[PDB]
Design a protein around this motif. Structure first.
Motif, mmCIF file in Angstrom:
data_model
loop_
_atom_site.group_PDB
_atom_site.id
_atom_site.type_symbol
_atom_site.label_atom_id
_atom_site.label_comp_id
_atom_site.label_asym_id
_atom_site.label_seq_id
_atom_site.Cartn_x
_atom_site.Cartn_y
_atom_site.Cartn_z
ATOM 1 N N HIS A 18 0.838 -1.187 0.000
ATOM 2 C CA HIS A 18 0.000 0.000 0.000
ATOM 3 C C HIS A 18 0.882 1.250 0.000
ATOM 4 O O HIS A 18 2.104 1.153 -0.096
ATOM 5 N N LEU A 35 -8.298 8.937 2.351
ATOM 6 C CA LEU A 35 -9.099 7.866 2.919
ATOM 7 C C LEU A 35 -10.279 8.469 3.685
ATOM 8 O O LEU A 35 -11.416 8.420 3.220
ATOM 9 N N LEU A 64 -13.577 1.001 9.004
ATOM 10 C CA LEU A 64 -12.225 0.472 8.955
ATOM 11 C C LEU A 64 -12.092 -0.672 9.963
ATOM 12 O O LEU A 64 -11.467 -1.690 9.673
ATOM 13 N N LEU A 68 -11.213 -4.309 9.102
ATOM 14 C CA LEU A 68 -9.947 -4.729 9.681
ATOM 15 C C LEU A 68 -10.123 -6.096 10.344
ATOM 16 O O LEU A 68 -9.200 -6.908 10.354
ATOM 17 N N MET A 80 -7.268 -7.936 -2.632
ATOM 18 C CA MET A 80 -6.556 -7.807 -1.371
ATOM 19 C C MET A 80 -6.560 -9.130 -0.601
ATOM 20 O O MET A 80 -7.601 -9.769 -0.465
HETATM 21 C C1 HEC Z 1 -1.227 -6.002 -1.366
HETATM 22 C C2 HEC Z 1 -1.025 -7.519 -1.459
HETATM 23 C C3 HEC Z 1 -2.192 -5.562 -0.271
HETATM 24 C C4 HEC Z 1 -2.035 -5.700 1.092
HETATM 25 C C5 HEC Z 1 -0.873 -6.370 1.787
HETATM 26 C C6 HEC Z 1 -3.061 -4.893 1.720
HETATM 27 N N1 HEC Z 1 -3.827 -4.371 0.744
HETATM 28 FE FE1 HEC Z 1 -5.361 -3.035 1.114
HETATM 29 N N2 HEC Z 1 -5.921 -3.244 -0.910
HETATM 30 C C7 HEC Z 1 -5.210 -3.899 -1.864
HETATM 31 C C8 HEC Z 1 -5.932 -3.769 -3.110
HETATM 32 C C9 HEC Z 1 -5.531 -4.310 -4.456
HETATM 33 C C10 HEC Z 1 -7.090 -3.083 -2.838
HETATM 34 C C11 HEC Z 1 -8.243 -2.865 -3.786
HETATM 35 C C12 HEC Z 1 -9.383 -3.841 -3.499
HETATM 36 C C13 HEC Z 1 -8.881 -5.171 -2.975
HETATM 37 O O1 HEC Z 1 -9.264 -5.536 -1.847
HETATM 38 O O2 HEC Z 1 -8.088 -5.810 -3.694
HETATM 39 C C14 HEC Z 1 -7.054 -2.738 -1.446
HETATM 40 C C15 HEC Z 1 -8.034 -2.012 -0.828
HETATM 41 C C16 HEC Z 1 -7.949 -1.574 0.474
HETATM 42 C C17 HEC Z 1 -8.875 -0.635 1.028
HETATM 43 C C18 HEC Z 1 -9.988 0.012 0.254
HETATM 44 C C19 HEC Z 1 -9.645 1.406 -0.277
HETATM 45 C C20 HEC Z 1 -10.480 1.716 -1.509
HETATM 46 O O3 HEC Z 1 -10.086 2.660 -2.232
HETATM 47 O O4 HEC Z 1 -11.535 1.067 -1.670
HETATM 48 C C21 HEC Z 1 -8.450 -0.335 2.301
HETATM 49 C C22 HEC Z 1 -9.166 0.556 3.284
HETATM 50 C C23 HEC Z 1 -7.236 -1.090 2.526
HETATM 51 N N3 HEC Z 1 -7.002 -1.829 1.405
HETATM 52 C C24 HEC Z 1 -6.477 -1.070 3.693
HETATM 53 C C25 HEC Z 1 -5.395 -1.936 3.892
HETATM 54 C C26 HEC Z 1 -4.657 -2.054 5.123
HETATM 55 C C27 HEC Z 1 -4.766 -1.123 6.301
HETATM 56 C C28 HEC Z 1 -3.833 -3.155 5.002
HETATM 57 C C29 HEC Z 1 -2.934 -3.754 6.063
HETATM 58 C C30 HEC Z 1 -3.515 -3.782 7.480
HETATM 59 C C31 HEC Z 1 -3.929 -3.609 3.634
HETATM 60 N N4 HEC Z 1 -4.847 -2.826 3.016
HETATM 61 C C32 HEC Z 1 -3.174 -4.654 3.084
HETATM 62 C C33 HEC Z 1 -4.026 -4.606 -1.708
HETATM 63 C C34 HEC Z 1 -3.416 -4.819 -0.474
#
Ligand code: HEC
Length: 104
Positions: A18, A35, A64, A68, A80
């Motif tokens: 991220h 966010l 969140l 989470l 994700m």
């Molecule tokens: C890469 C392998 C990722 C890891 C590790 C984490 N996230 Fe992530 N996130 C990733 C993608 C490709 C996306 C888009 C949709 C999906 O789920 O694939 C997201 C999305 C989020 C969102 C939504 C934001 C949006 O614009 O809709 C949030 C709030 C988010 N992710 C938070 C988040 C946190 C805090 C993580 C570690 C605790 C985390 N992500 C890990 C890819 C990846």
């Protein structure tokens, strides 16, 4: 809420995946700058899936949290990958930092 506890956690959980800082370009996932106060799929630089892009919901401290706890379910068929978090505190600090990380 200590951001550190959320920083380190955000690393071991969100490491080189991220982004928050402006310098943090979109890589594995979408960046998080506006966010708090921004819905999902608000990245005109990186289009997400049809499941997340449909997740029309704001990223607050009330949401969140749940996500989470279990983001997988929160968005099925997503890209994700995560197992989830047990401790609610570790999640708070996580959102306590991501907020100061995005806001900035
Ligand atoms: C890469 C392998 C990722 C890891 C590790 C984490 N996230 Fe992530 N996130 C990733 C993608 C490709 C996306 C888009 C949709 C999906 O789920 O694939 C997201 C999305 C989020 C969102 C939504 C934001 C949006 O614009 O809709 C949030 C709030 C988010 N992710 C938070 C988040 C946190 C805090 C993580 C570690 C605790 C985390 N992500 C890990 C890819 C990846």
């Amino acid at each position: 809420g200590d951001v550190e506890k959320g920083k380190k956690i955000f690393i071991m959980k969100c490491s080189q995946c991220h982004t928050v800082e402006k310098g943090g370009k979109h890589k594995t996932g979408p960046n998080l700058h506006g966010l708090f106060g921004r819905k999902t799929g608000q990245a005109p630089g990186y289009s997400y899936t049809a499941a997340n892009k449909n997740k029309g919901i704001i990223w607050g401290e009330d949401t969140l949290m749940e996500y989470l706890e279990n983001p997988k379910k929160y968005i099925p068929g997503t890209k994700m990958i995560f197992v989830g978090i047990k401790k609610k505190e570790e999640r708070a600090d996580l959102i306590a930092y991501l907020k100061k990380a995005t806001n900035e």
